Design a protein around this ligand. Structure first.
Ligand SMILES: *c1c(F)c(=O)[nH]c(=O)n1[C@@H]1O[C@H](COP(=O)(O)O)[C@@H](O)[C@H]1O
Ligand SMILES: *c1c(F)c(=O)[nH]c(=O)n1[C@@H]1O[C@H](COP(=O)(O)O)[C@@H](O)[C@H]1O
Lengths: 259, 256
């Protein structure tokens, strides 16, 4: 490992992607490395959470394909909230098709994901055509992408050579790929962000293969940058205080690693 | 090697698989049309004209600019009229808890109109577990993606073997594979193969093509999935018939 740089300093690296630098600078300014996984089915609840929790988060992660009442105008309201509170919007679409198809899934259809999503993510299983296809729409739109190097779930096949393949692909598409979904630091290059889902304060899982680790384990011991938290926050009675708990945990773990 | 008709009757066969296998036998088609178009009107006109020639119509509804559930109602009507299955090529690849909602809910309500969906095995078996919580009650089936057609695909070796084990352990819901060749020896499982064209080639974004004769005849797969080879042709009906006769003959020759 080389000497660890603050988020603010990483935001200035020669090879940093513009989207990554925007993110890094608001993380430093706001003292948050928390990404909210806004896993709700109603546009109202999504906008209520984005508004109240916006001050506490660096990023709001969406699954637009589970919103019962999606319209583009809800994403307009979301963008306003993103601009007011200063967070990025990440559509967790986990693209996993051939380049020719992913291009259309990203740009078109009802969702027009590229129109409103600062970031998206993609699996590397199809080989590099998946990134090439996404790039063709993402680069003109000044967007970035995360590659899924590891998954949080039991029996995940994103291990060993697969994970190494994700890193190699990220390096080769640095004008579009800004980092990873992973459970650990997976690249030594500080220009890359590491975002980690499967995070809760308490040990446990769900009944469908999800596994949880703590913010201190993920950021502190495993070297990731940002925790992604859904149910840990969304299921809590006071979602604001839960968000603050996770923010303070992830931030302190980052400071101590720095540190 | 058993005929499609005989496989439809296998003791372990899923009811979706046997409905498919029966209509494949009856219609003499093992062609799945990959209806990769962005307009509902074009999708519907393709399904109607090409319906008699296909055993399955594969959609990407997330590419349809004018998706509505009424469009899917109109597609179901044609599916019943011409006798084909509807396959949403949604290539689910998230944790079990998420795919459940992506499959049942949101705008698309995929489970309400899709006979079949597919899923990547990368997340581990929870992806199947979550999908089957919605699909079993609705009497749907699922295909697991054991191999991909694209350049640099990581769905090889131990990955493919994992997909096969996962299928066999979820045989109540999983009916087969998306693969480039036969990956399983169990005749209850369907093999469907994308990356198929009559001519050698690929595209500019990593797609690779093999012929129906190579895929069905030499590699032991059951059904070809064909998109651009048909959709980009002037006369889509004659293109479909060319693909049908190729895939059908190749099957008969392997059966012989
Ligand atoms: C995506 C992914 F690629 C993983 O490896 N793990 C993972 O959980 N996801 C998605 O992240 C969120 C986790 O939410 P939680 O378990 O905190 O509620 C979910 O959106 C899931 O889709
Ligand atoms: C999906 C998949 F998992 C593969 O391994 N290969 C593959 O091509 N797909 C999808 O199949 C269709 C092939 O279309 P064509 O190249 O004939 O137009 C596409 O819908 C692609 O998404």
């Amino acid at each position: 490992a080389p000497k660890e740089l603050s988020f603010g300093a990483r935001a200035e690296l020669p090879r940093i992607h513009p989207v990554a630098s925007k993110l890094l600078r608001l993380m430093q300014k706001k003292e948050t490395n928390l990404c909210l996984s806004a896993d709700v089915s109603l546009a109202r609840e999504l906008l209520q959470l984005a508004d109240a929790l916006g001050p506490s988060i660096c990023m709001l992660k969406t699954h637009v394909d589970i919103l019962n009442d999606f319209t583009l105008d809800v994403m307009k309201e979301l963008i306003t909230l993103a601009k007011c509170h200063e967070f990025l919007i990440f559509e967790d679409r986990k693209f996993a098709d051939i380049g020719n198809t992913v291009k259309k899934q990203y740009e078109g259809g009802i969702f027009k994901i590229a129109s409103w999503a600062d970031l998206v993510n993609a699996h590397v299983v199809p080989g590099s055509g998946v990134v090439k296809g996404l790039q063709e729409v993402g680069l003109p739109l000044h967007r970035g992408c995360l590659l899924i190097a590891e998954m949080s779930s039991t029996g995940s096949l994103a291990t060993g050579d697969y994970t190494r393949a994700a890193v190699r692909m990220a390096e080769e598409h640095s004008e579009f790929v800004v980092g990873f979904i992973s459970g650990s630091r997976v690249s030594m290059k500080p220009e890359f962000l590491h975002l980690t889902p499967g995070v809760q304060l308490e040990a446990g899982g769900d009944n469908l293969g999800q596994q949880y680790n703590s913010p201190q384990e993920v950021i502190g011991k495993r070297g990731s940058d940002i925790i992604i938290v859904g149910r840990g926050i969304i299921s809590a009675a006071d979602r604001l205080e839960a968000a603050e708990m996770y923010r303070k945990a992830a931030w302190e773990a980052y400071l101590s690693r720095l540190g």
